[PDB]
């Protein structure tokens, strides 16, 4: 039950006729799935690893100029020549300097001048690319059983880790005692790694767009150059200075590491040491619960006394988790657990750790339940020695609805057109929504690519104004809606 | 001649001696002895507990 | 039972070890070594020089 204690936990409720549910996993986020007769499970994408990265381009961020040579021509004789001028490891520039009798020419005019310095790279940033077939996502499936940690077991927790690769994208987790779960994942859509570069600078790495990386203004090698003697775009990292038209000097343009760090703002940082681990991905899977079963359903209710060994606490998600221990005769037994009113004549809350059972007597089991908004009483055990605990939930139903709508809108903003697959069970409405969102997201990405959030807000305000002052009601409402949507996206973007 | 230095700017730094302190929720902010010293760059944030 | 201290507020204080540093006009800002210790309270102002 790892998904408690994380603020991004999200609840998927229900499966389809086929016993499957579509869930989108994310690295920061966590998913808790609850089905009628299936146990509650916690799914988290922990590791995304890109393997066998190939370098496509090396950029120079700190250059050096060493052997400066110059050649001068007298006026009306054209441009001079240097043999270093057609050497590719030399950066050269042609200019004009005043010439005359003092200079040694004999004619009065502009004399051509050329200066060359050898370009040497002292530090570079490797932009690597990974084939989409080499992504290996790692997921952990932990059955939300309530069992505590076991030292003797080879696996201390009963969470099972399953690796999903693009070729072997179908895998089943065998949760001991709970049957098995099958993940039908789609790695090829999680991230488009044919438009991404794994940009590793000195000791740090980022996941960046590939056209952005190919359009950087720095000297670059093609990536297969071991010698590094043919830098391209060398003039972006040097400056040629000709003041007063008397001399010409060329100097290096300074370590560009800080400028690159400033240019990397808005790029997610990813580890690129001891493997290419990305902790920013999302993965879409189809969860099949048909072979997943509740543990201990053929047990009898416990008749003994329970003591709380860990005081009831409220998680960030509006549920409560308590830890109880058993002092009764029936070794394995179902724990009687209800959330009722003060008079115990109505059931107000629903359990999250479905089928809490007590496998071993001297082994506490911790139960997550969702009490109702307001006052409620957690009853644990049967009448002789029964323990009744009060609790107050400080929210409101309208508040929770607003928070849920905000969370849905936020996931739409993050996983645009893929949020429809976060809790979908099939269905016509889900497919229609996903198709319309795909079309509109294509249009939005076309019309808002490479634009900052302030520009997004400005455009949203302009569009909303245009809609507000519109003669036609249909266009007015459509434009006002577009403006509101782009205002929200600009507010929520760049995180 | 004889220009007097007006302001020194840092163009390349290095961070070291990193340290962290945490508090449980609703218990205010943690305290690091290094916060007293002004050559330590410090920041306060909240993490899920 | 067993309350946890959330914050601590100062009602009575005292000042000691007062030091000052001055800079000639147009030459920037004065510098004090104690300005780097956060238990020292400091203020920058301009005087006629």
């Amino acid at each position, epitope marked *: 039950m790892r998904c408690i204690g994380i603020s991004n936990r999200d609840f998927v409720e229900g499966v389809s006729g086929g016993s499957w549910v579509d869930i989108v996993l994310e690295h920061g986020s966590c998913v808790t799935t609850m089905a009628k007769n299936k146990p509650t499970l916690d799914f*988290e994408l*922990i*590791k995304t690893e890109a393997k066998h990265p190939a370098t496509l381009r090396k950029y120079c961020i700190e250059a050096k100029l060493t052997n400066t040579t110059t050649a001068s021509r007298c006026p009306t004789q054209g441009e001079p020549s240097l043999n270093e001028e057609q050497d590719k490891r030399f950066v050269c520039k042609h200019s004009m300097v005043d010439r005359g009798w003092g200079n040694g020419c004999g004619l009065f005019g502009k004399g051509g001048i050329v200066t060359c310095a050898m370009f040497t790279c002292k530090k570079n940033m490797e932009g690597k690319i990974v084939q989409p077939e080499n992504l290996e996502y790692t997921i*952990v499936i932990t059955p939300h059983s309530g069992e*505590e*940690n*076991a*030292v*003797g*077991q080879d696996t*201390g927790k009963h969470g099972k880790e399953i690796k999903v690769t693009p070729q072997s994208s179908i895998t089943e987790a065998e949760l001991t005692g709970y049957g098995t779960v099958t993940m039908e994942c789609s790695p090829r859509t999680g991230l488009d790694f044919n438009e991404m570069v794994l940009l590793q600078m000195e000791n740090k790495a980022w996941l960046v767009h590939r056209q952005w990386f190919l359009d950087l203004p720095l000297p670059w090698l093609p990536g297969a150059d071991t010698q590094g003697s043919n830098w391209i775009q060398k003039e972006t990292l040097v400056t040629f200075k000709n003041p007063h038209a008397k001399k010409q000097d060329v100097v290096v343009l300074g370590s560009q590491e800080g400028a690159m760090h400033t240019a990397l703002t808005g790029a997610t940082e990813i580890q690129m*040491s*001891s493997g290419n*681990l990305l*902790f920013t991905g999302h993965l879409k899977c189809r969860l099949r619960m048909d072979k997943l079963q509740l543990k201990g359903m053929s047990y009898s209710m416990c008749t003994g006394k329970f003591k709380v*060994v*860990k005081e009831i606490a409220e998680t960030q998600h509006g549920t409560i988790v308590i830890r109880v221990q058993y002092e009764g005769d029936g070794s394995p037994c179902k724990i009687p657990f209800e959330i009722m009113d003060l008079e115990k004549r109505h059931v107000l809350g629903r359990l999250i750790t479905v089928n809490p059972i007590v496998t071993e007597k*001297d082994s*506490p089991v911790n139960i997550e339940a969702e009490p109702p908004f307001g006052d409620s009483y957690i009853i644990i055990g049967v009448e002789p020695g029964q323990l009744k605990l009060s609790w107050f939930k400080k929210g409101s139903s309208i508040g929770q609805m607003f928070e849920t709508t905000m969370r849905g809108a936020k996931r739409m903003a993050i996983l645009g057109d893929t949020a429809w697959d976060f809790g979908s069970l099939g269905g016509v409405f889900t497919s229609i929504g996903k198709a319309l969102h795909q079309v509109f997201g294509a249009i939005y990405g076309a019309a808002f690519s490479g634009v900052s959030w302030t520009m997004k807000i400005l455009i949203g305000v302009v569009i909303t104004w245009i809609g507000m002052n519109s003669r036609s009601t249909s266009l007015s409402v459509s434009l006002v809606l577009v403006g509101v949507v782009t205002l929200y996206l600009g507010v929520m973007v760049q995180a | 001649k004889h220009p007097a230095t007006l302001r020194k700017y840092c163009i390349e730094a290095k961070l070291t001696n990193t*340290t*962290t*302190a*945490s*508090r*449980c929720p609703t*218990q205010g902010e*943690p305290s*690091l002895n290094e916060e007293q010293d002004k050559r330590f760059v410090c920041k306060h944030s909240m993490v899920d507990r | *039972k*067993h309350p*946890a*201290t959330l914050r601590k507020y100062c009602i009575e204080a005292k000042l000691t070890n007062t030091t000052t540093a001055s800079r000639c006009p147009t030459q920037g800002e004065p510098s004090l070594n104690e300005e780097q210790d956060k238990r020292f309270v400091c203020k920058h102002s301009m005087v006629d020089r």
Partner: antibody, heavy 125, light 110 residues
Framework: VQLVESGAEVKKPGASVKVSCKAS????????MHWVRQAPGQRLEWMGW????????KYSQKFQDRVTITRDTSASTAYMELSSLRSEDTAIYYC?????????????????????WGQGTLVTV | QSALTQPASVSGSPGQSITISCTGT?????????VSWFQQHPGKAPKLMLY???SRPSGVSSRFSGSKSGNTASLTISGLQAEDEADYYC??????????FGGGTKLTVL
């Protein structure tokens, strides 16, 4: 899961003694390796931990300038190096483990930290 | 973040219940649930008896119970068999990311 250290070492004061703990039975890279000393007849004393996943470390202030902790991923061995030894450093040195988080960062421990120790190493001076 | 305080010695006749106190500060023991009790027999490495204040490892008897009140955490042994005679060390993960061990206590049992 067994943690094995080196044999007892005798050092003259002012010398440097390096001890080691060999982690078997579990993924070495996924666990953080702590060093705890205990003077004969004194209490235990935490020295520091090495995050074998990426080599990160944290030493107790009492040993920050003297104790050095290093790892050998392939050898699955952790090293405890305490230079500038003194009379007071005569004590049995233990090695205890602690799993690092899913991302190898290791800044929050696990509630069951120091679950498995080593038999300890005796250093005398 | 200094050494936790425990009584030097504790004794109890077999079959009695024996309690050990570990007193820390708002960061050592009163701030976090990183309270673990270690049992060390002479000439041997410490054994993790309790953790998370109350929890005990899989192989640890049920006679060991832990409680924490304010800045003080207590360890209680019920059966108090002869094999329970050992040095009991308390530890806690302090707010600064370090580990502090209590002075330790000894059970004489007889």
């Amino acid at each position: 899961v067994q943690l094995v250290e080196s044999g007892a070492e005798v050092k003259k004061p002012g010398a440097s003694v390096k001890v080691s703990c060999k982690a078997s039975g579990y993924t070495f890279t996924s666990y953080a390796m702590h060093w705890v000393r205990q003077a004969p007849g004194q209490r235990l004393e935490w020295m520091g931990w090495i995050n074998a996943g990426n080599g990160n470390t944290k030493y107790s202030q009492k040993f920050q300038d003297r104790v050095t902790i290093t790892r050998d991923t392939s050898a699955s061995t952790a090293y405890m190096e305490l230079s500038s030894l003194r009379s007071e450093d005569t004590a049995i040195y233990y090695c205890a483990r602690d799993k690092v988080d899913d991302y190898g960062d290791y800044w929050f421990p696990t509630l069951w930290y120091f679950d498995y120790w080593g038999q300890g190493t005796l250093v005398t001076v | 973040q200094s050494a936790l305080t425990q009584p030097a010695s504790v004794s109890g006749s077999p079959g009695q219940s024996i309690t050990i106190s570990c007193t820390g500060t708002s960061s050592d023991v009163g701030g976090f649930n990183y309270v673990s009790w270690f049992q060390q027999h002479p000439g041997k490495a410490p054994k993790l008896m309790l953790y998370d204040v109350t929890s005990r490892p899989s192989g640890v008897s049920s006679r060991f119970s832990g409680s924490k009140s304010g800045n003080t955490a207590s360890l209680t042994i019920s059966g108090l068999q002869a094999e329970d005679e050992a040095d009991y060390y308390c530890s806690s993960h302090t707010s600064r990311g370090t580990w502090v061990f209590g002075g330790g206590t000894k059970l004489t049992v007889l």
